[PDB]
Structure formats: C-alpha cells, structure tokens
Symmetry: D2
Subunit: 209 residues, 4 copies
Amino acid sequence: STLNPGTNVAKLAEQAPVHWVSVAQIENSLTGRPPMAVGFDIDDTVLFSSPGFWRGKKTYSPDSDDYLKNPAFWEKMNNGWDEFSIPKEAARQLIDMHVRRGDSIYFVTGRSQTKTETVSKTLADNFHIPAANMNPVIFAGDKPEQNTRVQWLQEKNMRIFYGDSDNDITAARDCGIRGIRILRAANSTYKPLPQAGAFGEEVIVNSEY
Amino acid sequence: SPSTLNPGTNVAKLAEQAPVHWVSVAQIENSLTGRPPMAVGFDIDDTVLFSSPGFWRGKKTYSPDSDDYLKNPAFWEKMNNGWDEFSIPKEAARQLIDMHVRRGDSIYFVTGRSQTKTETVSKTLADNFHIPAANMNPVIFAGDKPEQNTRVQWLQEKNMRIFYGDSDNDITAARDCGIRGIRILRAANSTYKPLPQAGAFGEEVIVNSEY
Amino acid sequence: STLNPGTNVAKLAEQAPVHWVSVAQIENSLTGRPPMAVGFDIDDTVLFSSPGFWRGKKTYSPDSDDYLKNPAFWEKMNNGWDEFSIPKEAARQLIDMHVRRGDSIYFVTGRSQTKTETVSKTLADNFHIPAANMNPVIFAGDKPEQNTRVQWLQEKNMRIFYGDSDNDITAARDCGIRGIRILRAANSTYKPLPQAGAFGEEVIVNSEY
Amino acid sequence: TLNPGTNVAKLAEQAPVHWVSVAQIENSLTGRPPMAVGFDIDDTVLFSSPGFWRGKKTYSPDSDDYLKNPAFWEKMNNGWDEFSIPKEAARQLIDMHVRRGDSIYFVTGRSQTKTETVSKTLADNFHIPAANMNPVIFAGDKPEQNTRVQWLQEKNMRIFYGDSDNDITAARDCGIRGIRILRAANSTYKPLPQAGAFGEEVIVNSEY
Ligand SMILES: [Mg+2]
Ligand SMILES: [Mg+2]
Ligand SMILES: [Mg+2]
Ligand SMILES: [Mg+2]
C-alpha cells in the first residue's frame, strides 16, 4: 500500500467481537463434574507439525499439495517426522488440567491412516499423559473402513472437542457438544489462517504457541 | 517499565489477549430476535454521554482539591440543567438506542446523579439520540448511596430485561436482578478514574464502545 | 454470515510501521542541549476542547461547520468555554519536562483571533507553567494581519513542534525542525482522525489522553 | 482473578518502539550502489526450532547441554534444516536486496562442522542467484574462527539483520545499521528477546 500508512487510536483499540476464554475459566466451568471423555485435534492444536508437512511438500509436491494424497508421504509423517513437531504450551496446560480431573483423553486426526504410527507414543511422551488417561490416536475419514470425526465424537461420548479448523468446531456443533477453538500459529504452513470465533465459539487466549 | 528507557516488546506480548467476552451491537440484536417489545435501561455518564466536561468544571469550581463537589447541591443544579450541552454523545450508544427503537422497546435512563428540582437531561438525551416519544421515558435520578446500590429498585420495578453501563455497580445491579448486564467501555480521557475492568464479572462487553 | 467475523493471530499481532516514542526518550534525546523554544498546537494536542466546539456547532450550525466562521462562536470559545476543556496527561508530561529543562514554551493555534482571550490563562493554570517559561497564545492563519503557522515557528526559532494534525507536522517539516505527533482522542468531534505517522514522524505513545 | 477484565487505555497502549517495514527500508536505500548486507540465520531467516527441538529431546531432554554436543551439530548442519521453515519476512528482505544487486551474507553462531548443507538449503528456499549468494559464515570465539564483529567488518557489511540482542550489539560495535527481526512465539529458544531494547529499528510482522 502506502509507504507511511500511519495509524490512529480507534484502529489501535479496535476489537473483533470474539468470545475469549482462559484455561482457568474452562477448568472452573467443569468443577464438580465427574471424569469424562474429551478430544483434541492434533495438527496446530496440540502439535506444530508444519515441519514435516513442509518437508513432505518440498519432497513430493514442490508445486502443489499433491503430497497429501501420496501414501509415501504419510508413512514418514506418521512414523517419525513428528519428532520434529513442536508441542504447544496451550495444549500442555489443557492436557495437564484434564489429567488432574481424571478425564479420558482422545486425539482425533484427519491425517491419512497408515499401517503403523508412532504419533500416539510421541503424544503420550511429550505431554506426560498417564496410562489410564491415554488413548491411541484415532484416524477419522470417509474411507469405508473408518468412521468420520462426528462418528468418533459420538461413539466415545466426548463432551468437549478442541481444534483450530472450522471443521473441528462444526463437528462438535453437529454432535451437540462444546467445541473450543485453538489459534493456529502464524508461521504454520497451513494457510490461510482460519477466522477463530466465526461460529460464535469460545476461543482460548494466547493459544498460538 | 516506567523506569525503563527502551523497554522494547515481543510478539507474545503483542498478540496477548485478555479473556473477555466481546460482543457487537449486531450480535446483541440477533440474540433478541423473536423477543417482543421490552423495557431496557441505560446508565448515563460514560455510557451514553461523555459528560466529563461538566464534572471537570464542577470539580474545579467547587472542589479543586477533592470530590466533595459530588455532594454539593449547587453543582448538581448546574449539571442537570445545562452543562450537558457540553456533553458529547457516544456513537456506540447511538447504535444501541436505534436498535432498541426499531424493536419498539421502552428505553429508560437510570443515573447515579443526584436529583434536582428541575432537569434538562431528559430533553438533551431525547434530542441527541432522536428518541420517539413512544419509547422515551424521563430520566430516573437514583442518586448514589454508600453501602447500597440505588439502581436495583428501579430495574426491578420497571421490569428492565437488559441494562447497559460502564461501571461495576451498573453490572452488579443487573446481576443482583438476574437480568442481562452489558458493559460499555469508559473513555480513556474521562476524568472518572481509574478506568474499570470491563469483563470483571464475566459479562458481555461491547467492542469499540469507548466513543 | 458476518455476525461473527472472528480473527486470527496474524491480525492480532499486526503492527503499523510507525516510529513510536515516549516522553522519557524525548527527554533523553535532549540531554546536554541548552534551553530552547518549543511550540504546541492547542486543540487535541494539549486540550480536549471538543466540548466547546460541539456546543458551538449545535448552537450556530447544527448542519454544517459554518459556526467556525461565526465571530459570535469564537468570542465564547476563546473567553470561557475552555473551562470545559479537558487537559491531556501526555501534554502535562511534555510541558513539565520542558519546564524542567528551562525551555521557552509557545502555543500556536489556528483558532480565529478575538479582541480578548482567556485561553493563555487557562493553559498556564492547568499546567502550572511558571511565568518564566510561559508565553501568550499565538493565533495564526491565512487571514490578514496575521502570520501563518510556519512564519511563527521561524520567527521564534522553535526547534520542536508538537501537534495532532497533518499541517502541524508539515509546518515543522517546512521549517526543518523536529515535528512530533500527538494522538487525537477517538471521541474528538473533529473527524476523521488523522493517520499519526503518515510522514514518518515520531508519534508519542498513549498520547490520546 | 478468573475474570481479570481490561480497559481501553490498556487495549491501545503501545511500547515506544521504532517500527519499520521492508518498503521503508528499501526507500531508505534509494540511490545507493550495491553493498554487502548480512543475516543471522536462526529465527531471522529460518524457523529452525524443529531441529533444535529434536536435538534437545535426543541429547538433553532436561537442559540445553545438547548445544555443546558434537553429535547434535553434525545432524543439525547436514540435513535437519530440511524441516526448517523459511520466514516470509526474510523472503521479502532478500528479494529486495537481490533486486538492488547487493551481496548477501549469512552469519551464524551455530557450531561449525566439517561439512554443512545449510548454504544449499538457503540458496534453494530463497532462490538466491549465484551472483548474490555466499557460503554460510560460522562465527565463533575460537582462535580458528573470527568473531561475528570481525566478519561484519571483514566483508564490509552495512546492514545486519537478527532476532537476538547480540545480533544488534554486534552491528552497533561495527558502527553499522542493525535491524531487528521478531522471534516467533513458538520458537524453542526462550525467553523471547525484547525487540527495540537498544532503540533499534524493528521490522513489523516479522515473526513469520
Ligand atoms: Mg488442526
Ligand atoms: Mg457511568
Ligand atoms: Mg490540533
Ligand atoms: Mg537468531
């Protein structure tokens, strides 16, 4: 645009009409409630996994997103590239809180399913999730041999679902449960960034890291 | 820091957000779809009017050293019968008032200002915000009592379902009554300091409502 | 649809390329320099005078800005209505700083001149400016029998000029001196707000009040 | 403190920092002949935390002792940057300098290894022409290496970009223009530095 655009105090103080919440407010809202099942999306919700996706694109689809359909990419992505995935502090706080409550923690992902996967171990290790609270990662999808995200949220009777994408929130709404938004990091390679709060959902403050 | 010449900053601090429930007028309006006409209330000072000019002159005239002017009947006479000619209407309030007029709601103004024999505040409000006679109601001067919230009785008796205000006591009054209390941001240049912590009771706060 | 526009972390952290400064930094930049002459714009720079201008318009030109040409308005505005004007904290800090340095303070305004004025008095009293550093307000304009803003900056050899409007900054620029921007409050009746920093000038932080 | 709230003074509050854009930097160089400019690497042009994270988890999960482990650097400098995400802000600065015909140098505090593929990763990701590219320079306080300051002087760099305090003070020591880049909030190198602490120019939106 212009070289010296400047600014004004109206622009400096302008706020989008979003419902922000803190981990502490979420915990307070669960007080007295018995252990329950809760779910987390993985990519850009608990793990900054862009490193692997970046290398995958560079390796199999420099000029496109075809790598996401390449089975060769997924074998490596689900079996080791998450060693380069950075865990989010927001997720750490949320998981620690649910662990203290004794809730059952599930991880649901849209990643293509592979024969083996080391993601479940990476997650349990990174977030120090006790055995009684950990559950193997769930690969949701359309495939005839797998259930959809909505189906899994219902089957496991998850009462809360955390995610950064619009489909994460709509799935929660579709099931009639509480969908909570996590901010996607600005340096994520999955762009453009989604509009957190676009469904009137709660959005966790400072959850980009 | 105030003692730090070049404090600098970082992206974590730049993007940092307070956990507040922000709402827009449109969202409020939408949340009232299907609701029949109802009674709603508005605080006056720093909610619908930036009245600091008159309170500032009042302090300088009667209590330059203190806030005793607020207990001076001479001050209230001047404040309620003319000084609001210097009071600037808030745009956020214009939008709320128009929205409620469209719905056909009865609008009330409940203020902590002291009651005076005569008052021109009601007219200033009706003229500045173009409030039809059908929706307008004379201002209720509830006064301000120590250890007691004067607004509660009025919200109950007039059966107000929503109450807008910038001060904590406006929100706690709505909470005491079990109705929806919505916060309006007090301007940074208001002479009524310190600024309150909007969202301190988990209430909805209207975005960009400082002007 | 757009009832919930939401937001994202890129937008939350976005910054306009503005050269922000604080009063302490300004003070530090003047260390060792002998006392000098500095000038201040009045409206929305040192005084939030919108109350008087608002009443002026509603009284003399409820449909336009013609009131700005009405001598009856200026008689009221320059002789008492500033008793309703709110002094700015940023200005207070700047003036105290310059007084400490022993600088000579001047106030230049584009307000129409009147045979008498009590503005100078209101300024000296509100800001406790000692007689030694105080100077009667200077009224400038394109009009006759008057010197323009630029002419007054040159004649008094003002080395710094503080203002909220673009012409305050350009005037300083035209005289080769240091022009520093003050933010105009969002509730000022003089709209639209200007783009502070539009000339690459220094802008004082939190100077809207 | 469950509901701390906020106020408009807080919402509009600005830190006294000198912000600049790539366009303003380019404008300030108008009419200047080609010159040498240098860039720090980690968190300046590359979000290299993925590699440092794996290194930490592998060699010293409870500390930063891995930064002094030779085995770590061998892998970091020879392939782990394939997981390093280039920064858009750097992409713009580099294109800008390449258009000017300036000579670009990359100076890093990473431990030097026998071989390195970092220079290759940089040239490819940022499509730097052969005419403007220079092999990465490893600066160090070892009698075999030259310090960061010496390299800046040696190559007569006029501008140095970096996210760290020592990147800025190095430029200040050489009497050249040191410009700050914002370290991403999710970098594993914490705490984040205070950009602007030396009254230096800081590039807006440079966290990605
Ligand atoms: Mg995701
Ligand atoms: Mg009030
Ligand atoms: Mg002005
Ligand atoms: Mg660095």
